[PDB]
Amino acid sequence: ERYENLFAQLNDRREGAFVPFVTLGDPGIEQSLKIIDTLIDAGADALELGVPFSDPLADGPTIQNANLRAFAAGVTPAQCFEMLALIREKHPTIPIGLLMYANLVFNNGIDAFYARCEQVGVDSVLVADVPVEESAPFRQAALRHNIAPIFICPPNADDDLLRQVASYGRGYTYLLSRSGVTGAENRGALPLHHLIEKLKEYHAAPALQGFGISSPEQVSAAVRAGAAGAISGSAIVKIIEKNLASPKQMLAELRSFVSAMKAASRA
Amino acid sequence: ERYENLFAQLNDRREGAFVPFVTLGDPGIEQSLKIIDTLIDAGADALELGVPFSDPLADGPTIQNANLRAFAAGVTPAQCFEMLALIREKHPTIPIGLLMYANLVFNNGIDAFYARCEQVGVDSVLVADVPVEESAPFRQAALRHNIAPIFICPPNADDDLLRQVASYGRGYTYLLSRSGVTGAENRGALPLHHLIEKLKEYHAAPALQGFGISSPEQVSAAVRAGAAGAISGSAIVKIIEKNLASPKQMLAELRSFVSAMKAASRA
């Protein structure tokens, strides 16, 4: 499937994946779709997409304000899934991962949520406030609907957690750069080689590092450390924010940034 | 002495005494002396004079404001005694009684206070916050200096108190019209014939009724009930207050009021 095919192709080319994140519908449905098409056309290997949530407790102010902009434009989960279907129609091979908050998954039924993900062509789901210890009904529903359940490897991971994530996760492993919440200003500086190596020993899904990644030097550093790729969200969102009143210049600067970040992944 | 001679003369004429009260030095030393000369010339049989005190707890607002006016003019007890000496030089026979608060008597020595009263020619002293039960050093000092100690017969007097007042008092007995504090607006309405009769049986000094006396009808009523006279303070002070900016009209209205009140005492 899509993650397995991506990582095999990137491995052939000796490349890491660059995976941008945006909030669906920020600043609007139509500009968000143009934003996503621009991220792909400028070199995004995969996508991570957030569904606007009222109380995003893992996000710093940048992504909080992205959610508020989406809500100001009236974006609902149902509209987000209509976007996802259109994105999948445009881009049949790119892996699409969702970053969800638990209540939006649980609201009208866990199974129904993953069924809808399958209908629109989503490849993976990470539920930010569902640790592996609470994941059973979520990962079962995901696998039942051919969705990869994504799990987080935090920098304080112990060995029993390493084995759990390696065993239950599919698609990719989310390698946290640091503690705290999302945010470009806060750079993760702790070395992660040890965790990357253990994940590989236990045959975990390939690791993508996320949180605080805002420069090409950080992308190459994660690749150089063994990670299969890097995720960048707040850095991307600040460009949207900085250019709200200049939609064209926004897309231009997004392409410039994505291209440079993806270039640094070509080790 | 002066009280005994007054009451003998009034008894001959079948008259009650009208005894005005003012605060010494209200609104000033010189106007106060003119006020007192006017009260006498208009028919006052005796005088009751207050020394301005900082916290007059037996006085209502009218006499509180009299004290404040006196203090505004810088009136001190020492200046009050200089006034008393001058008043005695002008009027050798009229009884002069002081209404004092205890701290002004006790301040620089009880005996010294009564000695000064004797020097200036004062005839009696009533200490408003010294009940008969606390009076020993006060009445001893008074008698030692040929000053009559005045005691209050309140409307709730019991028989043991009647005998005490009749035994320890000299000059006159202060017959309270009512409970509360000084004030012309509050008229005493409780019949006092019973107390007046008991005082006479026990050979008390003649009774002067005070508190709330503000009309000639109240003067004649007290005389008719057996009292030897009546005291009026707040009624007099309100005339001073009403006419502060018109010194001449003040003296005129004082004379009009005193003459009518004294007329009603001629039973």
Place this chain on the structure above:
Amino acid sequence: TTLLNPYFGEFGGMYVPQILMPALNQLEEAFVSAQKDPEFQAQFADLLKNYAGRPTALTKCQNITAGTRTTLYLKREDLLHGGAHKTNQVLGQALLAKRMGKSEIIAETGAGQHGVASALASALLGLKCRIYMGAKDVERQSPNVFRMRLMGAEVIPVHSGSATLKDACNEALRDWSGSYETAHYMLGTAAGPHPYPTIVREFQRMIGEETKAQILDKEGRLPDAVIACVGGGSNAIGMFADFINDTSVGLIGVEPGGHGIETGEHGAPLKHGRVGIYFGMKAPMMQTADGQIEESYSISAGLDFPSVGPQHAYLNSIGRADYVSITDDEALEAFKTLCRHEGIIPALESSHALAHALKMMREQPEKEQLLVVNLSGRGDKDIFTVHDILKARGEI
């Protein structure tokens, strides 16, 4: 893996980002160890008695039940140091923080009552305390804010969202997720992820334990019911816990009805919400059809929270406890009635519980019933709020 069961039936759990699970597991272990440790128990008891003032009085109402067959006692948590029950569990949690080697405290507050309690415990016990408080609660509760700062706490206004308790909770959790190595999150109610609902209950259960002993001493029997307000659930579970196995004793929790349930402006998720996952727990919450968390409302900032602790959700589901609501105006009338007729100024939170007890009495005045209301706090903090209401209604 956990040492203790994280769920009460369907409700509860540990729905936090993976990064925080070590902190939660360490806290559970420290708590289980502490509960078996005589030295910890002795230090906690010493603080409760000699610093906070336990045991608190159980006051028989003299005037407000006249003409009825209701006997009403008030459990006087208003007399605890700090002015509310919050002080009980903050002293235990602060001791746990020290047992774990933590030097800093994070806490959220709405009534400012848990903030004051966290600030005073940190001052006593040598911890550095930072408090998150909705900026609307900041500009309304400036006196309590100053109290916290006087006691050396940092108070951080929160402007996001409704600018009230839910938003303070969010920021506290965001903070604790990059500071758990040195900071203990002193959660202020019996909610949030395991082990908090269990810890807060165990550090509040002296309320009901004392009440039981006191009522047996004064009346020779257990109450027909005990009544407590429910914002997140700490004071109510503290009163309820020791009576759960006394099946004849009714347990009544009172959620804020705000302007009226029918208006949507209330804080009554347990009876008028829908199960969801947020705040680290699976619990009833006020939410839109799409699963967005709704904003709550109450005249009482301490009850202005769109969820509720999982043990109450469970006790309701099985019918052991009953939950009702009381509106702003009903709470205000109870506040005034207690002031004028017993000389006790109650917290507006606690006035919700009193208001329901008054209803039980007035609706059935010849029903013989022995009731206990948990007077969770004093109403000193609320006199300005109440004044501005009475002035706006031409009543003063």
Place this chain on the structure above:
Amino acid sequence: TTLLNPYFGEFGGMYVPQILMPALNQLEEAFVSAQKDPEFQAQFADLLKNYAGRPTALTKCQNITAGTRTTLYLKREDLLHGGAHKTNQVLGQALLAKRMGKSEIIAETGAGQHGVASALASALLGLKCRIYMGAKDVERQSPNVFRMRLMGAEVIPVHSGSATLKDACNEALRDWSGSYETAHYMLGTAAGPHPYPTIVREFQRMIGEETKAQILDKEGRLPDAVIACVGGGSNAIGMFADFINDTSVGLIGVEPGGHGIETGEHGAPLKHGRVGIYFGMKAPMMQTADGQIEESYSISAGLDFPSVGPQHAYLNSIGRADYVSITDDEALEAFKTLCRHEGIIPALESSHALAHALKMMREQPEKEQLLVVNLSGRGDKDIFTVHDILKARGEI
């Protein structure tokens, strides 16, 4: 004639207008009868325990004596219902008022603390309460005024004189002199005419009685000294009384030094005044050379009174008790220190006593001494006063 001695040496007496002597004699008789009456004692004890919250804690300071050989305990009258020791004696006086068939209460207040206490006792016990308060204290203590009114009391601002406590006292006495038949004058301190200094002491002496038992239990010996602020004398004599015959126990009363004794702006008549007669008693008072009563000053409205109770004047004269003064700024530093280091916000009145204890410790830090400070009230009422001071001094 009286049943009890109205004087303590030279000081005391009954210097009231003759009209009020029957009221005073009736009160003395009711008090002597009540003190021999088991039913009165049982009702008073019941109210103190189950309504007001006695006994109060004795708190060992954990942090403010570090680095010294002083052990410091705080007697926690701040934890009594209403927030100060005042509640003790108002409950007894209200019961006496009922014993005498009185239906109304007159009281004066400066801190608003005795006003609040009178209002709450009247509400509980069914009495109609009117409170006199200096209009300057009114416009500064509007929160407490509203509390009193909430509890059904009438609050009457007094604009005369200094517009503070002395002036409230004057109006209360003027009122009681035309209303004694139906109103009881609930004097708020151990001053005024006999029998008030004796009654207030006897209805406050549980403070020292409890303290003694508590210190023997925790330390096995009596304190080296007990320390209390002195505005009129109630909280100090309540702490002192049971130790008077324990001649090794120092008794230290702390008068307000205001801006400094040398400025004349203080409330320290016992050491810096002159004996006089006012307020119904012979006692030290601040007065001019001519015998006019001077106005006092303190940052603390509860200590802003230019006289003092006669039993303190007597205990000082014979050397049984020692009296000192503490300035505004020293009191403020003690307030801040207790907030930050023990998590207790003290009344500014009580902060004078703490400030002197801190001085005893800091001046002689290797002196081994066991001290008790009477923490007469909590400082909730004072947080605005303190805030406006700290803002004016650029400290916040």
